[PDB]
Design a protein around this ligand. Structure first.
Ligand SMILES: Nc1ncnc2c1ncn2[C@@H]1O[C@H](COP(=O)(O)OP(=O)(O)O)[C@@H](O)[C@H]1O
Ligand SMILES: Nc1ncnc2c1ncn2[C@@H]1O[C@H](COP(=O)(O)OP(=O)(O)O)[C@@H](O)[C@H]1O
Ligand SMILES: Nc1ncnc2c1ncn2[C@@H]1O[C@H](COP(=O)(O)OP(=O)(O)O)[C@@H](O)[C@H]1O
Ligand SMILES: [Zn+2]
Ligand SMILES: [Zn+2]
Lengths: 230, 49, 48, 603, 105, 524
């Protein structure tokens, strides 16, 4: 009697040994992993995790040995590195003792000259650059005009010169400080594109947005280098 | 004809970037000591840290 | 590490780490079901 | 058969009696060490019990599977009086039969060899599983409130039971996974080694079972010898064989040996300290970097510094400075450029011998891609992920496409490789050093043009290499006196620090030593730089730049690691500055020769 | 299973090729009545999606009416009952759980 | 402890397997062809114990070829069902069993038909006497074997049924389809296709035999002593294991033959494949890496996987005639060069990884970019094969042609004089009847260097390489250490060729002059 019955969600995960440390001679091995109720959807593929679990045994309808079973883990709880990479998830719910001190920081007069002193511990000179980069991370006049023809608030900055002189380095620190920063290059990178790539899902053959820096970086700065090689 | 881009790229650089900064200066004898002695103070003795 | 998993300590609690590759679908399982006999017109309930 | 009672007490008497050298009862050592390490395995020599009573060795050869019923009980019986309640934590002892005489080629195993003990040769390939499977079996029962007690499981076949302790009943029995206990099982492919196959035939291959925690004690691509019992493996799904009833055979492995982990220890570490203080080991280490040629120290000095690397550091949570030293090896194709890094693939740890595209175990790309078995999906990382701590060795660096070039460039640029494919988004650490081998465009070095014009590669991928090593032709009566003799000596015959200490000394340093530099007098680097920097712009076309100065510190500290110093010595820089300037100057046009004299001021 | 929201007792009636009395029969095709069946599979709208992840999709069954008013690639809102029908695993023999779908109203 | 195998051999006739006819089923027959695969030697059940599940009674007397499961009597007649049994794996006989695949002889295929294949099976001590890739002869039984895939073929298929007459009131009707293939079962195998030493000794004692061999290693070709030496030397090895480290070396010799078209360079490859027993020939356009390197058959027919005798795994210990070399692709030439950067070959598919042995020489015929040989270019530019695969060739032979009337009339005569029936125009000093067996005596000779030779050899590499000072006249390619290594492994070839165990430098001077002759002019 389905209309007087109660049901729950469970999920199948696969975990594999991190490819940074595996035998040179062969592929990594992996474990079928399962979880139930509120433990579902807590984790995103490609995050780094520790699982606490029951290493358990089941029978697989293979087609494996003369008499055998397959291992699996029932997750009974999970935790992670605090957030893997940059993910569109973010926190707006700052605490009362943060607004208190951000307001007090706003009431320093030197605040602009403090950030230009702050946004670069190492880099020497190049004030006329760092000053502009401070202006970048703040966005700008996002304007939803009534005809819909909005204008960008963000700003675009180009570094040009002979190598050295931090023209590549200055992006690396920006990828630390800025919310949802992404660091890529011309021609994209290994297994990543610069711009939105579409392809079929190998199973169920569904078109979907695979990825790209401009797609992940929704809501922040994109760092690009070798911009001639597009 | 050539590999990669073409002079057309002269547009997207000047038209679509809100600032372009051109940053080369020429081997000034005191500058390459100033930056060097700062960069030494990076690698160890952590004085900048 | 998975490399050190063994038939030793099967069904103990284990702590291990890796990368999640994939996350499949939120399949649906019961926790209460109510059941009637199609001939006895007789009702029970089961919980898990 | 009750005769086994006679065999048991005979071998019980053997194990405890057997004195052979110095009169010692060596099995007391074999079993106490068995116990205190919680070893499941005893080690047994065929020559010893055969020298005692050959009928044991015959019975073992004829019908080992039944004979091994007796050994494990007797050894546990001896073990339990040696260690009371050892039976609590360990259920039984396996015996590793060893030193078995009749080695066969994997070809000639045939009809009579099965059900008998055999020693066989092959290469380990296709390790699959570590899975559990039954050893102690118990079942639930539905129609009564209690289980079926313990049944042992024979490896070859399943079991069935009717009886129940409360009832005789039809309804199902099912495995009580609340108690059932499992051995370790693995499937291995064994292949005849290439170098022992007669002309034109193909290496026959067999499927091998490893048990009893002998899982994960070999890794594929090494020659392995095993003791085991060969058998026809009837296991169902066999009536489907049309035509003749022809049975798939298997070997079950008792013992497995790698001879035909490496690590630093108290009794060995300290001799490196005294050696590390003995008289200028660096140029003695440069000699042991290449046994097969006379060669030339200018490449070897670069390779040694990559093998020790530098020190990674950060400026309060950011500003990563690369610990890795990267090398480009270049010169006319006839000069040795693959063989030297082929030695590195031996001598290094976590080191990979990558090649672009085919005939390569790793393609220099991080990827998500098929695996056939179960259509399993997993990442294959690039070699730069597989070697994240150590070094990636790239052969024919020029001969690569777009994708397998952007990968290395992204790794050098920022030491982490993106993934954003197949629905997985990750950045993988690629903190790996490089030795790259390349060839000039047209083979001849064409010394009248700069390196960036001689090679096809452009300056910024070329500049991520701090050290460029070059060799040209040598026409004169040196090479034809030396080189021909070292070459012909290699065919005619069919001072350095020994290799095993050398490969041990790199790993002992890197896992311990982080040599600082203290800013008492190091400022002079800026003075020498302030000279050499300015003076190359005026007379030469290409610049010297902070990226070079950066590498001087990180090359100097490598010799401090090789010295095992607490901090950078004032003349570790003197080694490094010569090693940098003879990278830059040799990279220029022949018109550079002025800069040899100008730099000789410090040389 | 798709004509009532409540799990009516199943009635696996047998198509009548013989009369109660035993006579032959013939079929009056078009005095019989028919209805259109369709299922359409809906996946999350890609601009609201937390991009990078895989698509996830569910099966919608349409009775006679709405069959004509969907086509692939259009942005569509559906309302209905997310029934969880059949009895997989717990009946018959063996895992994957119940077949879940929306009755599109 | 007793089993027998019996063979009849030397039957009066050979029947080409295209003329297999079902009128011969179960009869003795004589067959020959090419073995295309072998397979894992396996146990065949033969006599086995069968035990009742109902009582401890057993039977060992067997029904075994097919129907191998159901003896009709239990040694106590009463059972709650008498007919059915279980086997035993412990008390059984077994015999070694093998399948090999045999292919029609390319000398006798029909016009336009493909080289027919059929399956032939081995029992007992005849097992492991077939070898892939070579001519074989057989005798044995014209067996037939059930085949299912003949469903969907035209014509009625005979179906058996159990009758229904004289039993009453007791696929339930009892029916079967009996459709068969025609394999073969062979009892005998041989690898088809005294006063000898009194000839072998007699030739090596004579002073000229080397020069006789040079003008008889390809009797019909006119001139071209250079390539004749090269091929004769190519049939002879050099010590591959010549290292202390426990890594081997490229002891074998590789050759490329080059020149404008209508050179007879292609004839050599036909002569070699006609003469060298471990040789095979490829057009080099019509090829794939998966046909040169061994393929795999994916775990089919209920056995495990099997390896398919690729053309370059075959021609172990010998020559592969790669005609029109340059029309190969990047894929398969790199597959070659990965099989020359190592003697070994490695294969991956389906997770099954195999490393094959290989050790081979290649004889390559190649053509310039425009066919016409550009005298005024280096061989790298003219030949258009990338430097790594242009490396690892001990020599290149280059031919250039023009009217030289004193020769052209002798050549024209040689061509037309050849067209008189089997005439002696190409009569050598001596024929293959001793040449092949002498080469085997030369192979197992394994000769060695000498002190004065090595000390003198070190100066001839200076002499050679000095010619590249003032270079680019009578010089057209770079000289490096591999030319010394080439020169070493030619030293064994002549030492084998002369059957001299311990060489002298005055013979190595002839190999040196061959390396010299191989070089070419360029415009200043
Ligand atoms: N202003 C600077 N302060 C400190 N270090 C610098 C500065 N400019 C360049 N460097 C040095 O340059 C290296 C980074 O090179 P970078 O300029 O980022 O590469 P690219 O030339 O491709 O931009 C660092 O090792 C750093 O020490
Ligand atoms: N001086 C030498 N002594 C001994 N062997 C040498 C010497 N020079 C070159 N070789 C051999 O030649 C080979 C050089 O090949 P390599 O230059 O690496 O190929 P590529 O030019 O295609 O990269 C090495 O394997 C080495 O064994
Ligand atoms: N010296 C020679 N001896 C025998 N045949 C020759 C000779 N020179 C040319 N030929 C002729 O060349 C033909 C062989 O073809 P070939 O010239 O090898 O083609 P390709 O030049 O494309 O390899 C034969 O028909 C033969 O008559
Ligand atoms: Zn019961
Ligand atoms: Zn019976």
């Amino acid at each position: 009697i389905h209309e007087s019955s109660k049901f729950i969600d469970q999920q199948f995960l696969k975990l594999q040994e991190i490819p940074e440390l595996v035998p040179v001679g062969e592929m990594p091995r992996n474990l079928t992993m399962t979880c139930d109720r509120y433990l579902t959807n807590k984790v995103i593929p490609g995050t780094r995790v520790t699982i606490v679990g029951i290493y358990s045994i089941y029978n697989s309808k293979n087609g494996s040995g003369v008499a055998i079973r397959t291992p699996y883990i029932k997750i009974l709880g999970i935790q992670s590195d605090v957030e893997t990479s940059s993910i569109w998830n973010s926190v707006t719910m700052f605490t009362e003792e943060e607004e208190e001190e951000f307001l007090q920081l706003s009431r320093n007069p030197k605040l602009y000259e403090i950030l230009t002193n702050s946004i670069a511990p190492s880099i020497f000179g190049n004030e006329d650059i760092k000053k502009a980069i401070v202006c970048l991370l703040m966005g700008g006049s996002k304007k939803i005009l009534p005809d819909g023809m909005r204008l960008r608030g963000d700003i675009n900055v180009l570094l040009l010169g002979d190598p050295g002189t931090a023209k590549s380095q200055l992006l690396k620190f920006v990828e630390k400080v800025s919310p949802i920063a992404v660091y890529t290059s011309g021609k994209g990178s290994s297994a990543a594109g610069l711009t939105a790539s579409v392809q079929r899902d190998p199973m169920t053959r569904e078109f979907y947005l695979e990825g790209g820096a401009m797609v992940l970086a929704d809501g922040g700065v994109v760092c690009i280098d070798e911009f001639d090689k597009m | 004809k050539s590999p990669g881009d073409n002079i057309d790229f002269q547009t997207t650089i000047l038209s679509r970037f809100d600032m372009i900064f051109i940053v080369k200066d020429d081997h000034n004898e005191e500058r390459d000591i100033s930056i060097a002695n700062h960069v030494i103070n990076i690698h160890t003795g952590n004085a900048n840290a | 590490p998975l490399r050190d998993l063994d038939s030793e300590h099967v069904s103990k609690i284990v702590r291990l780490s890796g990368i999640i590759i994939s996350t499949s679908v939120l399949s649906s399982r019961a926790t209460y079901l109510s059941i009637m006999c199609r001939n006895c017109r007789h009702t029970t309930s089961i919980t898990i | 058969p009750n005769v086994s009672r006679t065999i048991a007490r005979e071998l019980k008497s053997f194990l405890l009696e057997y004195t052979d050298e110095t009169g010692r009862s060596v099995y007391g050592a074999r079993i106490r060490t068995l116990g205190e390490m919680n070893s499941e395995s005893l080690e047994v020599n065929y020559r010893h019990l055969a020298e005692s009573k050959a009928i044991l060795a015959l019975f073992l050869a004829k019908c080992p599977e039944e004979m091994l019923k007796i050994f494990d009980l007797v050894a546990m019986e001896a073990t339990e009086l040696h260690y009371p309640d050892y039976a609590r934590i360990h259920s039984e002892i396996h015996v590793r039969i060893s030193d078995f005489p009749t080695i066969y080629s994997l070809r000639e195993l045939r009809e009579s060899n099965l059900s008998s003990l055999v020693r066989v040769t092959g290469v380990v390939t296709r390790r699959t599983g570590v899975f559990p499977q039954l050893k102690y079996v118990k079942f639930n029962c539905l129609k009564c409130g209690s289980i079926l007690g313990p049944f042992f499981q024979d490896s070859n076949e399943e079991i069935r039971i009717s009886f129940c302790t409360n009832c005789k009943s039809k309804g199902p029995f099912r495995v009580n996974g609340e108690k059932t206990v499992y051995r370790n099982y693995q499937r291995v492919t064994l292949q005849e080694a290439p170098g022992t196959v007669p002309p034109g035939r193909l290496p026959r291959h067999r499927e091998v079972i490893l048990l009893a925690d002998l899982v994960d004690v070999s890794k594929p691509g090494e020659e392995v010898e095993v003791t085991g019992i060969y058998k026809n493996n009837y296991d169902g799904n066999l009536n489907a064989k049309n035509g003749f009833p022809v049975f798939a055979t298997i070997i079950e492995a008792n013992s497995i040996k790698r001879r035909e982990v490496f690590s630093w220890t108290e009794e060995e570490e300290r001799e490196f300290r005294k050696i590390s203080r003995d008289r200028g080991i660096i140029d003695k280490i440069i000699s042991s970097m290449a046994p097969s040629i006379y060669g030339h120290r200018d490449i070897k000095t670069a390779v040694a510094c990559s093998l020790f690397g530098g020190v990674p550091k950060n400026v309060n949570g950011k500003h990563s400075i690369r610990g890795d030293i990267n090398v480009l090896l270049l010169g006319d194709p006839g000069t040795a450029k693959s063989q030297i890094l082929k030695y590195v693939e031996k001598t290094a740890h976590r080191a990979v011998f990558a090649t672009g595209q085919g005939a390569s175990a790793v393609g220099l790309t991080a990827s998500v891609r098929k695996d056939p078995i179960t259509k399993e999906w997993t990442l294959e990382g690039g070699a730069l992920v597989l070697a994240d701590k150590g070094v990636c060795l790239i052969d024919e660096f020029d001969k690569m496409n777009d994708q397998d070039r952007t990968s290395i460039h992204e790794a050098m640029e920022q030491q982490s490789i993106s993934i954003s494919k197949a629905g997985i988004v990750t950045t993988l650490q690629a903190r790996c050093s490089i030795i790259a081998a390349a060839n000039p465009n047209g083979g001849r070095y064409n010394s009248t043009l700069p390196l960036a014009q001689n090679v096809s590669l452009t300056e910024p991928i070329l500049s991520r290499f701090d050290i460029l090593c070059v060799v040209r032709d040598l026409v004169d009566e040196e090479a034809d006196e030396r080189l021909a003799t070292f070459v012909v000596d290699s065919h005619v015959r069919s001072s350095p620090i020994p290799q095993e200490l050398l490969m041990k000394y790199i790993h002992y340093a890197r896992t311990k030593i982080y040599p600082k530099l203290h800013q008492m007098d190091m400022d002079k680097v800026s003075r020498v730089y302030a000279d050499l920097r300015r003076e190359s712009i005026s007379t030469g076309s290409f610049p010297i730049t902070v990226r070079h100065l950066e590498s001087i510190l990180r090359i100097a500290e490598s010799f401090a690691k090789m010295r095992l110093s607490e901090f950078v010595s004032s003349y570790d820089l003197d080694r490094a500055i010569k090693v940098v300037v003879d990278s830059f100057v040799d990279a220029q046009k022949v018109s550079v020769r002025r800069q040899l004299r100008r730099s000789f001021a410090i040389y | 299973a798709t004509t009532t929201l409540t799990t009516r007792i199943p009635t696996p009636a047998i198509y009548p090729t013989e009369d109660t009395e035993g006579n032959k029969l013939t079929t009056e095709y078009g005095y019989s009545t028919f209805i259109d069946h369709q299922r359409i599979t809906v996946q999350e709208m890609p601009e609201m999606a937390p991009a990078g992840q895989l698509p996830r999709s569910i099966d919608v069954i349409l009775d006679d009416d709405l069959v004509d008013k969907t086509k692939p690639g259009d942005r569509v809102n559906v309302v209905g009952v997310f029934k969880s029908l059949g009895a997989g695993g717990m009946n018959q023999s063996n895992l994957i759980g119940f077949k879940t779908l929306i009755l599109g109203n | 402890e007793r089993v027998f195998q019996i063979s009849f051999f030397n039957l009066p006739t050979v029947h080409r397997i295209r003329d297999i006819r079902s009128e011969k089923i179960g009869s003795l027959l004589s067959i020959s062809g090419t073995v295309t695969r072998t397979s894992e030697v396996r146990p065949e059940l033969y006599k086995a114990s069968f035990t009742c599940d109902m009582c401890r009674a057993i039977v060992d007397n067997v029904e075994q070829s097919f129907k191998y499961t159901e003896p009709t009597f239990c040694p106590n007649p009463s059972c709650e069902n008498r007919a059915f049994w279980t086997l035993n794996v412990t008390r059984s006989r077994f015999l070694d069993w093998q399948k090999v695949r045999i292919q029609e002889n390319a000398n006798e295929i029909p016009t336009g038909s493909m080289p027919r294949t059929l399956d032939v099976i081995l029992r007992g001590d005849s097992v492991e006497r077939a070898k892939p890739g070579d001519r074989c002869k057989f005798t044995g039984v014209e067996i037939v074997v059930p085949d299912v895939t003949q469903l969907g073929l035209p014509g009625v298929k005979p179906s058996s049924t159990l009758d229904t007459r004289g039993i009453s009131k007791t696929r339930s009707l009892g029916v079967r389809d009996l459709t068969y293939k025609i394999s073969f079962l062979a009892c005998h195998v041989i690898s088809i296709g005294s006063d000898e030493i009194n000839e072998l000794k007699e030739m090596v004692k004579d002073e000229h035999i080397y020069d006789k061999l040079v003008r008889s290693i390809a009797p019909a070709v006119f001139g071209h002593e250079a390539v004749k030496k090269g091929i004769l030397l190519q049939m002879l090895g050099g010590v591959h294991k010549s290292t202390v480290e426990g890594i081997k070396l490229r002891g074998d010799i590789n050759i490329c033959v080059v020149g404008d078209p209508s050179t007879s360079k292609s004839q050599f490859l036909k002569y070699v494949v006609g003469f060298a027993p471990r040789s095979v020939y490829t057009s080099g356009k019509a090829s794939s890496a998966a046909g040169l390197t061994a393929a795999v058959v994916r775990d089919e027919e209920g056995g495990d996987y099997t390896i398919e005798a690729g053309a370059l795994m075959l021609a172990d210990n010998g020559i592969c005639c790669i005609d029109e070399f340059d029309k190969m692709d990047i894929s398969d030439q790199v597959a070659i060069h990965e099989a020359m950067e190592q003697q070994t070959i490695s294969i991956a598919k389906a997770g099954i990884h195999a490393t094959l042995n290989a050790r081979t020489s290649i004889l390559a015929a190649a053509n310039p970019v425009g066919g016409r040989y550009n005298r005024k270019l280096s061989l790298r530019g003219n030949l258009n094969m990338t430097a790594p695969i242009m490396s690892r060739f001990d020599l290149f032979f280059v031919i250039l042609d023009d009217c030289n009337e004193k020769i052209d009339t002798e050549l024209a005569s040689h061509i037309v004089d050849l067209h008189m029936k089997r005439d002696e125009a190409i009569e050598p000093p001596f024929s293959a009847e001793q040449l092949r067996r002498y080469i085997k005596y030369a192979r197992t000779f394994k000769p060695i260097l000498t002190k004065e030779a090595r000390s003198y050899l070190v100066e001839k590499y200076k002499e050679l390489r000095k010619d590249d000072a003032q270079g680019f006249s009578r010089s057209s390619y770079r000289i490096t250490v591999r030319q010394l290594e080439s020169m070493i492994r030619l030293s064994e070839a002549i030492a084998r060729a002369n059957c001299v165990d311990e060489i002298t430098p005055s013979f190595i001077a002839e190999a040196y002059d061959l390396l010299r002759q191989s070089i070419i002019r360029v415009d200043v």
